[PDB]
């Protein structure tokens, strides 16, 4: 979708391994702000609003 017409998914009920997400090499630009990318999939996050 477009940027103003941005689509939001509320992702719930996960055993979410994000370490294989950014280690897929198709993703070019990756950053994170309050959590480092090292310790994402060691925690609980209550949701993903993507």
């Amino acid at each position: 979708a477009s940027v103003y017409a941005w689509n939001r998914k509320r992702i719930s009920n996960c055993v979410a391994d994000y370490s294989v997400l950014y280690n897929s090499a198709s993703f070019s630009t990756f950053k994170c702000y309050g959590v480092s990318p090292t310790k994402l999939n060691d925690l609980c996050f209550t949701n993903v609003y993507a």
Partner: protein
């Protein structure tokens, strides 16, 4: 209540110590007042600030 100046010393002790309890909840400009939030979220070279 002439004995309450002893209680003033007691309440000054407890008041200053509950203040030292109470500014643990102060974050002093940081993102949390809990350190283990920062240690459970951040890598150290951006966490020392």
């Amino acid at each position: 209540s002439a004995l309450g100046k002893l209680q003033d010393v007691v309440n000054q002790n407890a008041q200053a110590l509950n203040t030292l309890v109470k500014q643990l909840s102060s974050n002093f400009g940081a993102i949390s007042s809990v350190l283990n939030d920062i240690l459970s979220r951040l890598d150290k070279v951006e966490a020392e600030v």
